[PDB]
């Protein structure tokens, strides 16, 4: 009727336990919401001592061989002349870290894939609620008899007890480990200081919409309405009334790509300027400079194009002294700030109309509406859960051009006390004129960030991490400390084959 | 008194974590509500020492 | 803050360093059963499924 | 810790078995897709011997008392002076019918409600697939030892074993019975004749859209496009060319509410007509008359309004003889049929874009789009399942004005061989100028259907029943035979109270 | 000649001709255990059935000729289903279990 | 079936 399937055992067999140590994460507080990869996108480890506070690890026999090239493991027996393999399962020992707790969960469903719900569920509170979790308290939160938790993991259900050629099974992922950094004793407070409210900086959506960033070859205009274009001007003027400011006081913005402040027409003789054309090229200010970004010195928004001001200057330079913001062409001169600061409270968030997506930063397209991938839009979770691991899910999905400079993250949230229709979160470093992860003693970008000084995901990273840190379970890590976690693994294999050849050494010239 | 059991039954354990208080010294004598009178969390990291 | 300071003069009231927030939590598990007549259900194509 | 709840038994108790017979359905073939109510909408039993091929019955102690007023049951003990009741459950005996099989299923979930999925699941093939069905073969399809199937049904889970006042429990529904008429031996063929394809008649959607029906006080126009109105004219002319027909040949349509054919201008002297105004009022034809409905005699569609023809006649009656359909104002004279016949095949139906809903017939609103209740739209089932019991779900829902004359049923189906964007199914009786359920020897509506002679659900009923009859499991019933099913019930009660009073009869004047 | 596959069973579910007792939406593995068939007596006509589960599926000229009612009725491992007219039975169907290919 |  029905028979057991039977295999004939190979002529020679050799047990091998691939034993070693795996880093689960190594994190600072400003990287807790990001995925730790030990083998990097080459910018990440530059001036960061830890890359991420959660990871997803896939282990395969080829990845175990790659860890042997790093000297991170031993093979108890070589496989050089036995081409068959018979995988029997794994032992893991998870160690208590000194300073940080952490949740683990693992899977062996042979089908390997990533999901948006998986990356959100890595959030420490959500992962801690899941079934078949393992919680590892730090040595500080619990002293234990054994300093580790040990468990045995069976092969994937698709990996049967049969022999397989090592070439076939080499790349088959035989284990997934998911880990997130946690605190049990600071679960609600986390790293909160003063109020429960966190402050988010954003680009004013009602004025900054053109997304025409990162060229010195283009005069910047902030919005289009109907057929019009609208333009921004800086001034150092002490004038109280927007009407009486001169046509000279304004510092027009003809670049977005640089950190440069520009300078006033009163410095014409310092830069040997002969015309308003040379004032435009030498003296124009980038709107995202540390004083213009929050209008520390006043910034003026208008329909009046710099080329209408060029016509007024070039028609007569002597009447450029006389002309004020009164009686100009299309004079919608107002006082507008490129940045607004919102307050977010996680306990006041109900997730009824929350939303999150990426838009293309370096393209000639207007507005902030969800565009491109509509299946990548993440909706209907509280912002601290909605943002957690979402950028890394998008990067691992590879459906966008990979570089942080070419996209912006945009999110909708009803629950900030002030509002903007979308939010374009910006990090305090970009709002203060400094590189994405550079120490606050610095007051300029580094040369590669002095270039490309415009809104993009590279400058948003610390702000969305700060929103994720408002969520529960997120750990408190002192500045300059890196928290770490490790597992010791032992994968059990047998190697199978016909009997191999061997060689020998002379007796006289041997260990004396 | 006897009841007739319904046709299909499904056990559910609603499992979770509840904050009992979060407090500074200057809020110890006040009731902690996690869902606030909107001024309380403005520049206070903990709202009350009992609940 | 004055009536909190008067309450802090009373016994059992904790000492918390300035800038530290003390916290407490419980883990709960409420046990329920859900009852009814048998519900409807739906299914996914075999070819377009977990590969 | 915890105690059993206990009740103290009442002073006197009297068992009563309410025993009787319930009709589950009584049906002809042309009523199989409709719900049987024994207590009618007063038009339904007029010239129909059976009202429906499925039913949903709710039984309550008050409905059992109402069946006692019809003499359909006995109470084994009266309840007159014992106000408490203790319901113990029910016994049902379902009898084999002579000629028809039938599926039963029952429920006792105290919460009583109707659903669109419930009414569709009454379809005989779908009901026969359900769990906890009972199939009762006819005496013809299976001879049995016992001529009935017997089962005991427990009280609703909300009805506990406690005593209740009879006033409180009177209206609580203690049982639901769902029954549908079936054939096991003709499951696929059913009542099919010739081809597997069924023919559906419909109103051309591309020309008949104005829905301005049922007034003799309004000149009918079939569609609006842009600012225009379009109009229909009948003719008995033998003319082969649409250009050369006279302005006289056309029989303009100024009524939709009547069965009247109208007559040609050549009969001016038979109706003492003096003007085209009297020709319009006496001689205009209804477009749904038995020759105009399918254009058996030619029917002409045009942008040219009858009032432009009035201006041509009234300006000079002598040039009305001379004028033809050439050189008329806005002359889009074409040959269009108000009806088209589609072919539907149930095995060719994939239900990918199937849809069904009711629109208001007597309102001044253009077009056929789903309107009013968007939650009542029924979608994504094959048309024989999608239509089954859907009109009765809508009637029982009471979200529309109840009368069949005030709504039309509209459905979308990709799978007819010819197509129309929506379909407006019409019964062969309305396509042949006869009352909704009147025998084919008749060639006119009855007086109440001579009035209101316009598209509405009352004239659609046999067409959607015919589409449901294309579906599997639907029975074959010879014309003039009514199939029937019955159950015998026994509800078990106790009556409770303090001891009642009693009276006596003289011995001398007694049974001699 | 009918061939049945799990995809043909899904297509019959789109026609509402079957039920699935449990959905498969989030469990991608399958373990087929076999089939039960109940063949019903028709009212008016008798009929021969035979079935196969040789995983290799193909058609042949000899197969189509052997469908002739007299030839099919001579084959081994036939099932004959008399009509209700030609034989009244205790059970109105013939039931048998079929193992996987 | 039934409970106290």
Numbering used by the authors:
A (entry chain T), D (entry chain V): 48 to 559
B (entry chain U): 52 to 102
C (entry chain U): 509 to 559
E (entry chain 0): 103 to 203
F (entry chain Y): 48 to 51
What do the study authors state?
Anelloviruses are nonpathogenic viruses that comprise a major portion of the human virome. Our determination of the LY1 structure demonstrates that ORF1 encodes the capsid protein and that anelloviruses evolved a novel spike domain that extends around the 5-fold axis to form a crown structure. The particle, formed by 60 jelly roll domain-containing ANV capsid proteins, forms an icosahedral particle core from which spike domains extend to form a salient part of the particle surface. The base of the spike domain, the P1 subdomain, shares some sequence conservation between ANV strains while a hypervariable region, forming the P2 subdomain, is at the spike domain apex.
To generate a higher resolution structure, we generated an ORF1 polypeptide lacking the C-terminus (ΔC-Term) in human cells (Expi 293) and determined its structure. To generate an increased number of particles to permit higher resolution structure determination, we generated an ARM-containing ΔC-Term ORF1 construct (residues 1-609) for expression in Expi 293 cells. Western blot and Coomassie-stained sodium dodecyl-sulfate polyacrylamide gel electrophoresis (SDS-PAGE) analysis of the ΔC-Term ORF1 construct purified from mammalian cells showed a principal band consistent with the expected size. Despite containing the N-terminal ARM region, the ΔC-Term ORF1 formed symmetrical particles similar to the ΔARM fragments produced in insect cells, suggesting the presence of the ARM region does not hinder particle formation. We determined the cryo-EM structure of the virus-like particles formed by the insect cell-derived ΔARM fragment to 3.9 Å resolution from 6271 particles and of the mammalian cell-derived LY1 ΔC-Term ORF1 particle using cryo-EM to 2.69 Å resolution from 22,743 particles. Despite being generated in two different cell lines and the presence of the ARM region in the mammalian virus-like particle (which is not visible in the density, suggesting flexibility) the two protomer structures are very similar (1.179 Å root mean square deviation when aligned over residues 48–562). Particles from both expression systems adopt comparable folds, including an icosahedral particle core. Absent from both structures is the majority of the C-terminal region (in the higher resolution ΔC-Term particle, we see density up to residue 562). The portion of the C-terminus we can see extends from the jelly roll core toward the surface near the 2-fold axis between the spike domain crowns. The local resolution of P1 is only slightly lower than the jelly roll domain (~3–3.5 Å), while the resolution of P2 is within 4.5–5 Å.
